[PDB]
Amino acid sequence: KEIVFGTTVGDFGDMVKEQIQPELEKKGYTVKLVEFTDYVRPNLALAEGELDINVFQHKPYLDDFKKEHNLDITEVFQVPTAPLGLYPGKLKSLEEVKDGSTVSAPNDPSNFARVLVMLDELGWIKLKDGINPLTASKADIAENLKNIKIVELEAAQLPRSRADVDFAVVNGNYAISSGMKLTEALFQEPSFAYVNWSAVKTADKDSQWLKDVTEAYNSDAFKAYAHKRFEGYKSPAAW
Numbered sequence: 001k002e003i004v005f006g007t008t009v010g011d012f013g014d015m016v017k018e019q020i021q022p023e024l025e026k027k028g029y030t031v032k033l034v035e036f037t038d039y040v041r042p043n044l045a046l047a048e049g050e051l052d053i054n055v056f057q058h059k060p061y062l063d064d065f066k067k068e069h070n071l072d073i074t075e076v077f078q079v080p081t082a083p084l085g086l087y088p089g090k091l092k093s094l095e096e097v098k099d100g101s102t103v104s105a106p107n108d109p110s111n112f113a114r115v116l117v118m119l120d121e122l123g124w125i126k127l128k129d130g131i132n133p134l135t136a137s138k139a140d141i142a143e144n145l146k147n148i149k150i151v152e153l154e155a156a157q158l159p160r161s162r163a164d165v166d167f168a169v170v171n172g173n174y175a176i177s178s179g180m181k182l183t184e185a186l187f188q189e190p191s192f193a194y195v196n197w198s199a200v201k202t203a204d205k206d207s208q209w210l211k212d213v214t215e216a217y218n219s220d221a222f223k224a225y226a227h228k229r230f231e232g233y234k235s236p237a238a239w
């Protein structure tokens with residue numbers, strides 16, 4: 001049986017090629033990997049049938065996308081994830097913020113919400129009490145304490161937005177594939193609500209191949225591999 005994986009390019013793809021694929025092949029499976037540079041296509045390819053499983057998103061994004069596009073897909077298990085971080089842009093230290101400082105952020109809703117929550121924790125802005133952090137939007141800002149100019153861009157353009165803004169909040173997969181290091185972040189999201197999940201069409205939730213893939217991502221072997229290959233990543237809660 002052939003298992004077709006869809007992942008964003010870089011780390012999640014490497015997990016498959018370097019570790020998961022060889023493990024599944026020892027069980028007779030032929031594995032195919034399709035890598036994407038964007039966040040939009042994977043879930044569509046999954047629902048269409050082109051992919052049997054994808055690994056590139058967190059639950060809030062999945063939930064948002066599924067609803068918006070009415071797709072019968074669901075999460076299965078979590079994977080080691082590169083954490084979200086606020087990195088040095090033109091300014092190199094949090095201490096250097098000032099009135100009007102610019103901060104770049106991804107512009108899709110589920111990820112943008114994360115930037116606002118991070119700015120609230122830094123005390124740069126103040127979010128209204130009782131709002132859903134998962135859906136925080138500009139309308140949820142009670143006071144822009146430091147008059148921060150939040151610059152929004154397509155998620156993939158964040159690493160290089162650093163040349164044009166004081167600070168840049170970059171998604172981990174893009175930070176890593178752009179030559180950035182997690183240790184370079186000035187502040188990292190403390191939350192664990194965004195550790196990424198693999199997704200599949202609901203129809204395959206109980207399949208045998210998915211059971212094999214699932215244990216391949218949770219064996220001691222994988223855990224050892226992950227510990228040395230992806231230092232600094234947030235681990236699946238189940239671990």
Ligand code: MET
Binds near residue numbers: 061111196
């Ligand atoms: C498509 S949702 C964003 C996924 C990305 N790997 C992150 O954890 O920030």
